[PDB]
Amino acid sequence: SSTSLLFEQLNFLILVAAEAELPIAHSTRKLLMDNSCNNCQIYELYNENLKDVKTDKDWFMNKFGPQTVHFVISNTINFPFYKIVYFDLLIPVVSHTWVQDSVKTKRHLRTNMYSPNPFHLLRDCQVYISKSSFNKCEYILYSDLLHLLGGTLVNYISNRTTHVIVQSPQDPIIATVSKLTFGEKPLREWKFVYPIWILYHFKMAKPLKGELATLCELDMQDTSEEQLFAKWEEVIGDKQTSSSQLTLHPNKTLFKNHHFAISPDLNFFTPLYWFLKGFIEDLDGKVTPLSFSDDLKSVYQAFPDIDCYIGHSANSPILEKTKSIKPEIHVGNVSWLFYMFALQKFTPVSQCKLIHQPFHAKLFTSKELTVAYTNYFGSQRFYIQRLVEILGGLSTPELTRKNTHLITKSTIGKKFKVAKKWSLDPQNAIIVTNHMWLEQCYMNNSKLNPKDSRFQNFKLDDNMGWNIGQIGMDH
Amino acid sequence: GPLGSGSSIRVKLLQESVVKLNPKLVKHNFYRVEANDSEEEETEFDDQFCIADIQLVD
């Protein structure tokens, strides 16, 4: 067998679901070891009586740490710590073929296509969401659902972009992307779709096909609001009940005895509000939209069951007034709802992540904070994109001289080597720092010094608790 | 809310391709990509890319 440094400094956990799977686990461990993995654990699910022990984050960190686990190798998601591994710790879960194909092709293949989660219906998609179609709260919601469906969000157009999400034929991005020609050969064949392409997969938990697939395609004749409304109603309207969305997410009373007040600073396209309201009510929750003209004391007196506030911005005066009337109210954003849906448990915001509270005012500008990142995998990449976005900056998967920072947790790879040299060049002077700088800047709402020693620690993978997304969580 | 006139989008292009790009598109900037990591068989290990900021067409 051949050897390489492909998996240098990475830790793997192989979950064996049945005795017959042991030879596959052995061959995968050999592949990992021959290509220089740091550590490879094999864990036989069938050989412990796990149905009487809480397999929570503490259990997982104690059993498989103290170092982090970079990848879980499993051909199934049917193990009782899947949600804490995947949705909390943000560790990818991939089939054995991810290892086999990554060795064959001598590279770290994207993990999405190898997820064994049947709800990851968009796993093969690389999706660009147009910022000239959507406001910030719409963009964040569509990004959240795309991510929950296993797709990849991109903020650049390339010949690998599979879908471009647009609101209407009036978006100028349509003609711009269509003019990306060379001579006149196109960069690729483009698929422009309305956001109901995402929403249908999320609501129905099955692939789009037939006429409903065609209705999600951009139609340049849809020049009126009425025509857009009509397509939304046919594709995700009340006659399309969630046929198998609850098969994969069986807690139909997730939001029972909760009643959410929806802040007016969420200015959704109205059929998108209807989608969100229906999503909550389908989980036995209640919904009351607030208006800028409401007398809040009157509203909360009439609906004393309202116990949650959902809003976009931390600095909304509506939220300030709400907290003075209801001091114990849960204060979250829309992302928080979808995180509880993923966890299948109602969870107070203080036990969730930094990205699940109404967002701070932008701390940085894009001129100050345009960051490349490296050595993150899977949902960690989505998290850093979101964190940089709500700090006020821009993120890039590529490294260029436009970048102000490189964010990394280790010293491996080409970008770290290049950026370290650039940091010493006065003509460039990029800053290399770890993700805890981003997290602490946001949590403290303050521009911390990225060269502090705690942000120059590039051995964070030595402790699983330093995984990105852990800062800010209450036990 | 949404970005409007005069804004741009990011386009990742082979460096070779830039000189052949539609001359009617307005390029705000172009940046050479360094330390590219191919994560798909469709990208070759030594492909040289750039990022172009392309103005939205009027």
Give the count of beta carbons closer than 10 Å to the beta carbon of residue A457.
Answer: 15
Q: Which tokens go with A262?
A: 């929806």
Q: Which residues from B are below 8 Å from A when comparing CB atoms?
A: 1-4, 7, 9-13, 17, 20-22, 24-25, 29, 31-42, 45, 49, 51, 54-58
- Closest listed residue to residue A437, CA positions, set A460, A403, A462: A460
Question: How many Å apart are CA A235 and CA A272, to the nearest integer?
Answer: 12
- Closest listed residue to residue B3, CA positions, set A286, A89, A133, A285: A133
The 3-state DSSP class for residue A306 equals coil
Q: Which of A107, A389, A394 to mutate to test the interface with B (most CBs of B within 10 A)?
A: A107
Instruction: Tell me the Ramachandran region of residue B35: left when phi exceeds 0, alpha when psi lies from -120 to 50, beta otherwise.
Output: left
A183 neighbourhood in chain B, CB within 8 Å: 20, 22
Chain A residue whose CA is closest to B16: A182
Question: How many Å apart are CA A110 and CA A126, to the nearest integer?
Answer: 11
Question: How many Å apart are CA A122 and CA A408, to the nearest integer?
Answer: 27
SS3 of chain B: helix, strand, coil, percent, to 5: 5, 40, 55
Question: How many Å apart are CA A45 and CA A151, to the nearest integer?
Answer: 28
B55 neighbourhood in chain A, CB within 8 Å: 176
Q: Which of A180, A396, A414 to mutate to test the interface with B (most CBs of B within 10 A)?
A: A180
On the 0-12 / 13-18 / 19+ scale of CB atoms within 10 A, A178 is: middle
Question: How many Å apart are CA A373 and CA A260, to the nearest integer?
Answer: 36
B12 neighbourhood in chain A, CB within 8 Å: 156-158, 398
Per-residue b/e over B39-50, b at no fewer than 16 CB within 10 Å? beeebeeeeebb
Backbone angles phi, psi at A37, to 5 degrees: -60, 150
Q: Which residues from A are below 8 Å from B when comparing CB atoms?
A: 105, 107-110, 131-136, 138, 155-158, 160, 172-173, 175-177, 179-184, 187, 267, 396, 398-402, 413-415, 417-419
Chain B residue whose CA is closest to A397: B36
Q: How many helices (H) and strands (E) does chain B have?
A: 1, 3
H or E element: which one contains B27?
strand B27-32
Residues with Cβ < 8 Å from B5, sequence gap 6 or more?
B56, B58
- Closest listed residue to residue A303, CA positions, set A281, A329, A336: A329
Nearest to A182 among B21, B34, B58 (CB): B21
The 3-state DSSP class for residue B14 equals strand
The 3-state DSSP class for residue A364 equals coil
Question: How many Å apart are CA A135 and CA A123, to the nearest integer?
Answer: 25
Q: Which of B16, B18, B56 to mutate to test the interface with A (most CBs of A within 10 A)?
A: B56
Residue A223's Cβ-side half-sphere holds a number of Cα atoms within 13 Å equal to 2
Give the DSSP per-residue string, A3-33.
--STTBT-EEEEEE-SGGGHHHHHHHHHHHH
Q: What are the CA-CA distances from residue A466 to residues A384, A412, A451, A462 (Å)? A: 14, 17, 18, 8
Question: How many Å apart are CA A95 and CA A80, to the nearest integer?
Answer: 17
Q: Which tokens go with A317?
A: 């005066």
Q: What are the CA-CA distances from residue A359 to residues A88, A355, A452 (Å)? A: 20, 7, 25
**Alpha-carbon dihedral of residues A415, A416, A418, A421, nearest 10 degrees?**
160
Question: How many Å apart are CA A258 and CA A280, to the nearest integer?
Answer: 10
On the 0-12 / 13-18 / 19+ scale of CB atoms within 10 A, A183 is: exposed
H or E element: which one contains A126?
strand A126-129
Angle at A37 between CA A36 and CA A41, to 5 degrees: 140
Residues with Cβ < 8 Å from A366, sequence gap 6 or more?
A392, A393, A394
Q: How far apart are the first and last CA of chain B?
A: 18
R_g over Cα of chain A = 23
In the block, tokens 């930094």 appear at A354
Question: How many Å apart are CA A175 and CA A192, to the nearest integer?
Answer: 11
- Closest listed residue to residue A468, CA positions, set A395, A399, A361: A395
A366-466 folds as Rossmann fold (3.40.50)
A182 neighbourhood in chain B, CB within 8 Å: 17, 20-22
Resolution in A: 1.8
- Closest listed residue to residue A423, CA positions, set A459, A474, A372: A372
On the 0-12 / 13-18 / 19+ scale of CB atoms within 10 A, B14 is: middle
H or E element: which one contains A164?
strand A163-165
Question: How many Å apart are CA A454 and CA A460, to the nearest integer?
Answer: 10
Question: How many Å apart are CA A194 and CA A235, to the nearest integer?
Answer: 11
SS3 of chain A: helix, strand, coil, percent, to 5: 40, 15, 45
In this structure, are residues A259 and A286 in contact, taking their beta carbons and an 8 Å threshold? yes
Q: Which of A174, A366, A399 to mutate to test the interface with B (most CBs of B within 10 A)?
A: A399
